[PDB]
């Protein structure tokens, strides 16, 4: 639906440090208070309740804002591309075991390429078993893999802890990835917390890119009657999607130089007032 | 002059040295792996290797190869590390000595005729060296096949991968081999007996667009080690200047590379390999003034 | 083509010494890394423009 981003999307684009000052810079930031659309991460069990399959293709027009409130860590990665397709070139992104696999690999991007995670016998512990994402021509210009391999699943159903935050803008194909990771208690909506976005990547691949989507888990174990797509009842995180738009936002940076509050400038008189002036007060 | 306090000049201290800070060179183009390798593609279906997201290498000539002939054709091999590309495409294959001579633009022969050729605006470094040791089979290798009857001429860049027998006089084939209707393809003698012209010889081409692209692939930086408490010239990656550089307790935030003040004048900055915490103080630069009675 | 420093503009230095590329100081003698330095025009009569 809609809900009211208090205040996400700030972070760092500039490495440059300023103590216990103001500074104010023009970026792809998010518009505060805007429409954000929440995405519903539910394996509603009803029997009229539909599985709420919440994966459609979503638009990359300038610059995607991402909050993902996962303590199920079944959102891994994200799907981009212009076409989507493997005639033109595409990026993917993926989380095998603490393990980003991001390619430039155009693989077929059909209605089902998604993870699937089963609790196995052999081992009790959920092992990942699906891999039905991709079958297609490789010609992978670039390939970055770094690889800890690790597990922190960590599957709560009760409440929201686990909130991480990513933003995924281009510039000239300096394709940059913000993150941040957060241990959050709400499990309403996104607090009202202020945080910063370090940057995490700058990958210089450079395609142009148009179409955004999202990637997660599909499988369940073997107490649940039925298969991947047909019975799963594990998915219990949620996640919110926005836009950047081009603005001029200003900062307050403190001593140790993280960003403690922003205001925008083309928000509201008062707003505006504490921009012109180059003041928070 | 009358009595009075006058202004000449700035004492402007000489910038002492010069140093160049740069990270370390973590990745690399592994061109051993691109030179060392057992076998090599066939001079009809060429391996066109894409070179890309690695540091470049250009350490001496005469290497494993040995660099036997070697030309750069539209680059300088000189600032091979210092002039920064990108795009790189990596055309190796195995042909004769005497066939070395095809490779020039428009150089003619049976592989610009079936297997092999580049362009006449080349700006990369074409590399053919005797591999009278790699290649080289002590009962002669025919195991690198090249196309020679084929109707039409091929073109570069393009590599043809198919067996399709040839129709000579127009003679309509079946399938057949025989009077004027061969297999196209044919096999080499590279004997170790053999003359120089007739030794085998690897080419391996590196060509590259000209900054097409945003610059995944460039030369390697060369980091002298700083001094400090002096007028340095200094040239960090991100941004060149003069000044006095010294130790200091600003955090800076590890991905945090550069620090400010409020007037946007960059004062403090961060060892580019090593977590240094440099403050960037000024040079002298007091005016010059002068008293005198008249 | 090939030579240490670009000329100053207004002179004109004919050095027929070979340049020294390639690590080795050569005495004349055209080889790898080492050739004439005055390279000539490669024109045949009434060629492209």
């Not at chain 1, 797509?229 to 836009?243: D, H, K, L, P, R």
């Not at chain 2, 060296?129 to 109707?151: A, E, I, M, P």
């Given at each position: 639906?809609?809900?009211?981003?208090?205040?996400?999307?700030?972070?760092?684009?500039?490495?440059?440090?300023?103590?216990?000052?103001?500074?104010?810079?023009?970026?792809?930031?998010?518009?505060f208070?805007?429409?954000?659309?929440?995405?519903?991460?539910?394996?509603?069990?009803?029997?009229?309740?539909?599985?709420?399959?919440?994966?459609?293709?979503?638009?990359?027009?300038?610059?995607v804002?991402?909050?993902?409130?996962?303590?199920?860590?079944?959102?891994?990665?994200?799907?981009?591309?212009?076409?989507?397709?493997?005639?033109?070139?595409?990026?993917?992104?993926?989380?095998?075991?603490?393990?980003?696999?991001?390619?430039?690999?155009?693989?077929?991007?059909c209605?089902?390429?998604?993870?699937?995670?089963?609790?196995?016998?052999?081992?009790?512990?959920?092992?990942?078993?699906?891999?039905?994402?991709?079958?297609?021509?490789?010609?992978?210009?670039?390939?970055?893999?770094?690889?800890?391999?690790?597990?922190?699943?960590?599957?709560?159903?009760?409440?929201?802890?686990?909130?991480?935050?990513?933003?995924?803008?281009?510039?000239?194909?300096?394709?940059?990835?913000?993150?941040?990771?957060?241990?959050?208690?709400?499990?309403?909506?996104?607090?009202?917390?202020?945080?910063?976005?370090?940057?995490?990547?700058?990958?210089?691949?450079?395609?142009?890119?148009?179409?955004?989507?999202?990637?997660?888990?599909?499988?369940?174990?073997?107490?649940?009657?039925?298969?991947?797509?047909?019975?799963?009842?594990?998915?219990?995180?949620?996640?919110?999607?926005?836009?950047?738009?081009?603005?001029?936002?200003?900062?307050?940076?403190?001593?140790?130089?993280?960003?403690?509050?922003?205001?925008?400038?083309?928000?509201?008189?008062?707003?505006?007032?504490?921009?012109?002036?180059?003041?928070?007060? | 002059?009358?009595?009075?306090?006058?202004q000449?000049?700035?004492?402007?201290?000489?910038?002492?040295?010069?140093?160049?800070?740069?990270?370390?060179?973590?990745?690399?183009?592994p061109?051993?792996?691109?030179?060392?390798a057992?076998?090599?593609?066939?001079?009809?279906?060429?391996?066109?290797?894409?070179?890309?997201?690695?540091?470049?290498?250009?350490?001496?000539?005469?290497?494993?190869?040995?660099?036997?002939?070697?030309?750069?054709?539209?680059?300088?091999?000189?600032?091979?590390?210092?002039?920064?590309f990108?795009?790189?495409?990596?055309?190796?294959?195995?042909?004769?000595?005497?066939?070395?001579?095809?490779?020039?633009?428009?150089?003619?022969?049976?592989?610009?005729?079936?297997?092999?050729?580049?362009?006449?605006?080349?700006?990369?470094?074409?590399?053919?060296?005797?591999?009278?040791?790699?290649?080289?089979?002590?009962?002669?290798?025919?195991?690198?096949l090249?196309?020679?009857?084929?109707?039409?001429?091929?073109?570069?860049?393009?590599?043809?991968?198919?067996?399709?027998?040839?129709?000579?006089?127009?003679?309509?084939?079946?399938?057949?081999?025989?009077?004027?209707?061969?297999?196209?393809?044919?096999?080499?003698?590279?004997?170790?007996?053999?003359?120089?012209?007739?030794?085998?010889?690897?080419?391996?081409?590196?060509?590259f667009?000209?900054?097409?692209?945003?610059?995944?692939?460039?030369?390697?930086?060369?980091?002298?080690?700083?001094?400090?408490?002096?007028?340095?010239?200094?040239?960090?990656?991100?941004?060149?200047?003069?000044?006095?550089?010294?130790?200091?307790?600003?955090?800076?935030?590890?991905?945090?590379?550069?620090?400010?003040?409020?007037?946007?004048?960059?004062?403090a900055?961060?060892?580019?390999?090593?977590?240094?915490?440099?403050?960037?103080?000024?040079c002298?630069?007091?005016?010059?003034?002068?008293?005198?009675?008249?």
């Amino acid at each position: 639906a809609y809900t009211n981003s208090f205040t996400r999307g700030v972070y760092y684009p500039d490495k440059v440090f300023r103590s216990s000052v103001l500074h104010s810079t023009q970026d792809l930031f998010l518009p505060f208070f805007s429409n954000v659309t929440w995405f519903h991460a539910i394996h509603v069990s009803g029997t009229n309740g539909t599985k709420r399959f919440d994966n459609p293709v979503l638009p990359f027009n300038d610059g995607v804002y991402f909050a993902s409130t996962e303590k199920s860590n079944i959102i891994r990665g994200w799907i981009f591309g212009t076409t989507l397709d493997s005639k033109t070139q595409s990026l993917l992104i993926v989380n095998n075991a603490t393990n980003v696999v991001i390619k430039v690999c155009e693989f077929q991007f059909c209605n089902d390429p998604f993870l699937g995670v089963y609790y196995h016998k052999n081992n009790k512990s959920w092992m990942e078993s699906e891999f039905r994402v991709y079958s297609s021509a490789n010609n992978c210009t670039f390939e970055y893999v770094s690889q800890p391999f690790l597990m922190d699943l960590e599957g709560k159903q009760g409440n929201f802890k686990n909130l991480r935050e990513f933003v995924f803008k281009n510039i000239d194909g300096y394709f940059k990835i913000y993150s941040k990771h957060t241990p959050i208690n709400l499990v309403r909506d996104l607090p009202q917390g202020f945080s910063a976005l370090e940057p995490l990547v700058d990958l210089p691949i450079g395609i142009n890119i148009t179409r955004f989507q999202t990637l997660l888990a599909l499988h369940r174990s073997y107490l649940t009657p039925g298969d991947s797509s047909s019975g799963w009842t594990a998915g219990a995180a949620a996640y919110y999607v926005g836009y950047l738009q081009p603005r001029t936002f200003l900062l307050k940076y403190n001593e140790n130089g993280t960003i403690t509050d922003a205001v925008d400038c083309a928000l509201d008189p008062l707003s505006e007032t504490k921009c012109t002036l180059k003041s928070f007060t | 002059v009358e009595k009075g306090i006058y202004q000449t000049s700035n004492f402007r201290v000489q910038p002492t040295e010069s140093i160049v800070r740069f990270p370390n060179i973590t990745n690399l183009c592994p061109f051993g792996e691109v030179f060392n390798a057992t076998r090599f593609a066939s001079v009809y279906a060429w391996n066109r290797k894409r070179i890309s997201n690695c540091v470049a290498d250009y350490s001496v000539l005469y290497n494993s190869a040995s660099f036997s002939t070697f030309k750069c054709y539209g680059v300088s091999p000189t600032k091979l590390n210092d002039l920064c590309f990108t795009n790189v495409y990596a055309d190796s294959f195995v042909i004769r000595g005497d066939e070395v001579r095809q490779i020039a633009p428009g150089q003619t022969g049976k592989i610009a005729d079936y297997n092999y050729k580049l362009p006449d605006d080349f700006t990369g470094c074409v590399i053919a060296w005797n591999s009278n040791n790699l290649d080289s089979k002590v009962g002669g290798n025919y195991n690198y096949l090249y196309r020679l009857f084929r109707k039409s001429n091929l073109k570069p860049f393009e590599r043809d991968i198919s067996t399709e027998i040839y129709q000579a006089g127009s003679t309509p084939c079946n399938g057949v081999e025989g009077f004027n209707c061969y297999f196209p393809l044919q096999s080499y003698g590279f004997q170790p007996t053999n003359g120089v012209g007739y030794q085998p010889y690897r080419v391996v081409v590196l060509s590259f667009e000209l900054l097409h692209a945003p610059a995944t692939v460039c030369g390697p930086k060369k980091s002298t080690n700083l001094v400090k408490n002096k007028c340095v010239n200094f040239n960090f990656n991100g941004l060149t200047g003069t000044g006095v550089l010294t130790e200091s307790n600003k955090k800076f935030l590890p991905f945090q590379q550069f620090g400010r003040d409020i007037a946007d004048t960059t004062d403090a900055v961060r060892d580019p390999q090593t977590l240094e915490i440099l403050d960037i103080t000024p040079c002298s630069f007091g005016g010059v003034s002068v008293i005198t009675p008249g």
